[PDB]
Every structure is written in C-alpha cells, then in structure tokens.
Amino acid sequence: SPYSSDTTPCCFAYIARPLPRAHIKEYFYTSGKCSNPAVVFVTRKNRQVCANPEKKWVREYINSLEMS
Amino acid sequence: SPYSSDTTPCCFAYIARPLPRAHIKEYFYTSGKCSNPAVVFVTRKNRQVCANPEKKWVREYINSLEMS
C-alpha cells in the first residue's frame, strides 16, 4: 500500500494515564510521519487510543503485549 | 465522540493532480488539527485520497460534489 496522497492513521494527543496492559489489547505506532509519533493502544473496545511513545510505561506495555 | 487521546483521521501528502470529480465520490476534510489540513476525496475505491485544501480545483470539486 504505497502511501502517496491519502489518509494517514496517526494519533493527536496521548492518553494522560498508563493504560493498564490488562484493559488494552494491542498498540499501533503511528505511521511515523505526522508530527505526532506514539503508540495507539487498541484496548478492549480497541478505539485507537494513543499513549505517547516516550511516556516510559507505554513501552512497558508494548513489550508486555504479545503480537496476536 | 469526544476526541482526547486516540487516533485522528488526517491526510499527509496531497495528490499532485486535480482528481476529476467524476472519478471521486466524496471528500473528507481532515479533523482540523494534525499539521496537515486538506480534503480527502473518497473516490470510487474511496481510499481516503487527500487533495490539498488550497489547491483551487479542490474546492471546485468539493462544492460540485453533493453530500450523499
């Protein structure tokens, strides 16, 4: 899927609270080019919830999460 | 849908060519907060195809398009 002139799945603001990996289901790091890099924890509802790339606990949940 | 810490449907680069309103089906202006405002013509395939907000012909297709 060559990205040229289309949409770009990214995040805007990061959640102000370490989403418990238990309530989260996964995480999707932004495409990597939208002035807002991060990791979108796709929780139970799986709403693409952002969580900030450098929020420390964020990476603690990324690795703790298993690529399903 | 209160947008706080989640994804943000936006566009990255604008298509370098006035998408013929005939091949387009609609257009979705970015959420309005991602350093990349524009109008993403959702054409036949409806891939969210950006087209730049100030590309002139872009607005000529936005109004020419009927909100279906």
Side-chain angles (χ1 to χ4, degrees):
Chain A
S1 293
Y3 293 126
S4 264
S5 36
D6 65 296
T7 172
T8 317
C10 260
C11 126
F12 183 85
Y14 328 100
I15 180 107
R17 237 259 208 153
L19 306 186
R21 195 269 243 212
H23 311 181
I24 301 178
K25 240 180 166 294
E26 14 257 0
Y27 59 90
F28 161 89
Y29 170 93
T30 49
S31 174
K33 51 185 284 242
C34 54
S35 329
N36 258 300
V39 281
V40 190
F41 286 120
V42 249
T43 80
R44 40 234 186 109
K45 274 175 198 257
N46 239 36
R47 274 167 208 171
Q48 265 175 64
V49 216
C50 206
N52 193 251
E54 222 140 69
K55 248 188 173 242
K56 266 151 193 128
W57 63 255
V58 269
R59 295 173 220 241
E60 264 246 25
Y61 302 171
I62 269 71
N63 306 354
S64 280
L65 279 150
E66 245 178 77
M67 198 71 178
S68 254
Chain B
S1 293
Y3 293 126
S4 264
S5 36
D6 65 296
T7 172
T8 317
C10 261
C11 126
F12 183 85
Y14 328 100
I15 180 107
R17 237 259 208 153
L19 305 186
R21 195 268 243 212
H23 311 181
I24 300 176
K25 234 181 172 295
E26 15 258 355
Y27 60 89
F28 160 90
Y29 169 96
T30 49
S31 174
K33 51 185 284 242
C34 54
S35 329
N36 258 300
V39 281
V40 19
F41 290 119
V42 250
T43 80
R44 40 234 186 109
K45 274 175 198 257
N46 239 36
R47 274 167 208 171
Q48 263 175 66
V49 218
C50 208
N52 193 250
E54 222 139 69
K55 248 188 173 242
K56 266 151 194 128
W57 63 255
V58 269
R59 295 173 220 241
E60 264 246 25
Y61 302 171
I62 269 71
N63 306 354
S64 280
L65 279 150
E66 245 177 77
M67 198 71 178
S68 254

